[PDB]
């Protein structure tokens, strides 16, 4: 069934320490958006995140600038930070920006818990099927794709691609959305399309709106 | 933009007369489901319907048994009742079950205000594109199609067919849905797919749930 993913994004240590866990009571999957920190504070802030959310599963996500994130890193810095956090903290899942940082993907080959991710804020690309195929054939823990529609048909394409790949790979977990106001319908289509990880806020949708929609759709 | 269609379905005259119009305040399009009456009471009940809803546009719908309705009529009886109601009352729109009563469609050729309708409660048929094409090429006032999905892909097919036909015929108004719990997503997809007439209740969805969804999608 559907899994709700809620982000945690402290900008410093005093903030991370100060987080209210009761805010996350309805959620068992936490995404630490480590890109909200300066690169030199990520490892310092990790203990607070892992200690606070010890009751939940934790995703380590270093969302980099080319993928819409708040940190600018070389692919080398990127993989080095991921591996250091991994070696010490053992996050349940690790986000890897497959296309942006493909040059260092060979360093990540042995990980069974990757969320292979791809975000396109410009368009729904003409080779989207090929992107699904390449990511799905790797059989990561999750295939995560977010694309910007430039027409209503773009939104339907995202939905139909997810359904086709899910039907061919029923054991593969997907988190796929069409972004923007235009693509918002796709955010409530996970049960139809085969997208089971739902990224929410506490285009973008809150947990409250999600619940209300899941109500009507059951 | 979207038009909400609310049904009126009295089973006798005392009932029709007794209807509370304030229930329909948010709605400017009324569907008189005349099939809830015995055939010999439809014309007797019409004055009450047309007088009560004089402020709104009115659809005359004789939904027959093979299309999921509450009356059993020959195609001849069907067209005769429609034409009598039309001659006296001038309904703003008339529903015509294009496939079920095709044998008498020649009698309806000159009407510019038809809702050509098709309901399949068994499946999403393999020639659905052909059904869209035949109905759309007639350029009725509305093409109305409701089909039962037997898989998630069936729901997406209904949605993609509507979008393709809408894009090719942007002046054509559509009212298309995938039925059941499975197809419920399609009921909130009208803006994406190009379905602008929304049939509600006061799978099936109420005006209240609709409003709440239109809120989130804008
Ligand atoms: Mg380890
Ligand atoms: Mg007339």
Swiss-Prot record, chains A, B:
Pathway: Metabolic intermediate biosynthesis; chorismate biosynthesis; chorismate from D-erythrose 4-phosphate and phosphoenolpyruvate: step 3/7. The keyword Amino-acid biosynthesis applies. InterPro entries: Aldolase_TIM (IPR013785), DHquinase_I (IPR001381), Type-I_3-dehydroquinase (IPR050146). The active site is at 119 (proton donor/acceptor), 144 (schiff-base intermediate with substrate). 3-dehydroquinate binds at residues 31-33, 63, 187, 204. GO terms for molecular function: 3-dehydroquinate dehydratase activity. Its EC number is 4.2.1.10. GO terms for biological process: 3,4-dihydroxybenzoate biosynthetic process; amino acid biosynthetic process; aromatic amino acid family biosynthetic process; chorismate biosynthetic process. It catalyses: 3-dehydroquinate = 3-dehydroshikimate + H2O. Gene3D superfamilies: Aldolase class I. Keywords: Amino-acid biosynthesis, Aromatic amino acid biosynthesis, Lyase, Schiff base. It holds the Pfam family DHquinase_I. Homodimer. Involved in the third step of the chorismate pathway, which leads to the biosynthesis of aromatic amino acids. Catalyzes the cis-dehydration of 3-dehydroquinate (DHQ) and introduces the first double bond of the aromatic ring to yield 3-dehydroshikimate. Belongs to the type-I 3-dehydroquinase family. NCBIfam families: aroD. This is 3-dehydroquinate dehydratase.
């Amino acid at each position: 069934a559907m899994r709700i993913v809620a982000p945690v994004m402290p900008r410093h240590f005093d903030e991370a320490q100060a987080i209210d866990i009761s805010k996350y009571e309805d959620v068992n999957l936490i995404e630490w958006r480590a890109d909200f920190l300066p690169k030199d504070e990520i490892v310092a802030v990790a203990p607070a995140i892992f200690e606070k959310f010890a009751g939940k599963e934790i995703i380590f996500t270093l969302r980099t600038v080319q993928e819409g994130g708040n940190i600018t890193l070389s692919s080398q810095e990127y993989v080095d930070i991921i591996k250091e956090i991994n070696a010490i903290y053992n996050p349940d899942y690790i986000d890897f920006e497959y296309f942006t940082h493909k040059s260092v993907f060979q360093e990540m080959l042995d990980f069974p818990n990757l969320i292979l991710s791809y975000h396109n804020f410009e368009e729904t690309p003409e080779n989207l099927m090929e992107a699904f195929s390449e990511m799905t054939k790797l059989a990561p823990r999750v295939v995560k794709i977010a694309v910007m529609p430039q027409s209503e048909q773009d939104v339907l394409d995202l939905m139909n691609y997810t359904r086709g790949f899910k039907t061919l790979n029923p054991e593969q977990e997907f988190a796929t959305i069409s972004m923007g106001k235009l693509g918002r319908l796709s955010r409530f289509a996970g049960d139809v399309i085969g997208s089971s990880w739902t990224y929410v806020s506490l285009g973008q949708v809150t947990l409250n709106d999600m619940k209300r929609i899941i109500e009507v759709l059951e």
